[PDB]
C-alpha cells in the first residue's frame with residue numbers, strides 16, 4: 001500500500017516504524033538511543049496513526065535490518081509530537097504522537113511499500129544539511 005501523506009486508516013490503530021526485530025507480545029519501555037542523535041536517551045516512544053509517517057519511521061530508523069511497521073497499544077497517555085505539530089503546517093496532520101509510558105506490540109503490517117528511493121534520499125540529504133548547519137533541533 002503506497003503511503004498517501006496525512007492519510008489515516010479506518011482502524012485509527014497506532015503504528016510504529018522501526019528496524020528493531022520486535023515481536024507480538026513484546027512490552028517496550030521508553031529510554032532507547034535516538035535514531036537522530038548518537039548517545040541521546042529518549043523520554044518517549046513515537047507512534048503514528050498515518051501509514052505515511054510509519055513508513056518514514058521504518059526507512060529513517062537506525063540499523064542494518066529492513067524497515068518494519070508494528071501495530072502498538074500504549075499503556076498510558078499520548079500527546080501531539082512537537083517535532084511535526086505546528087512546525088510548518090498547523091496542527092498534526094501526520095497524526096504523530098508520543099508517550100512517556102510503555103507500549104505493547106500487538107501485530108505487524110506486512111503489505112506496505114516504502115517511498116520511491118529519490119524521495120528517501122532527498123529526506124536523508126535534507127536532514128544531513130540541517131545537521132551540518134546546526135539547524136537539526138530535536139524535541140524530546
Ligand SMILES: CO[C@H]1/C=C/O[C@@]2(C)Oc3c(C)c(O)c4c(O)c(c(/C=N/N5CCN(C)CC5)c(O)c4c3C2=O)NC(=O)/C(C)=C\C=C\[C@H](C)[C@H](O)[C@@H](C)[C@@H](O)[C@@H](C)[C@H](OC(C)=O)[C@@H]1C
Pocket residue numbers: 005036053056057060083084085087088089093094096122123126127130135136137138
Ligand atoms: C511524521 O514526520 C515525518 C514525515 C512527514 O511528512 C511530511 C509530509 O509532513 C511534514 C511536516 C508536517 C513537517 O512539520 C515537517 C518538518 O517540520 C520537517 C521536515 C524535514 N524535511 N526536510 C527534508 C528536505 N528539506 C528541504 C529539509 C528538511 C519535513 O519533511 C516535514 C514534513 C514532511 O515531509 N522539519 C524540518 O524542516 C526541520 C527544520 C527540522 C527537523 C527536525 C527533526 C530531525 C525531525 O523532526 C525528526 C525527529 C522527525 O520528526 C522527522 C524526520 C519525521 O520523521 C518521522 C519518522 O517522524 C518526518 C518529517
Ligand SMILES: Nc1[nH]c2ccc(Cl)cc2c(=O)c1-c1ccccc1
Pocket residue numbers: 017018033034035036040041042046056057058060061062083138139140
Ligand atoms: N520519530 C522519532 N522522533 C524522535 C524524536 C526525538 C528523538 Cl530524541 C528521537 C526520535 C526518534 O528516534 C524517532 C524515530 C525515528 C525512526 C523510527 C522510530 C523513531
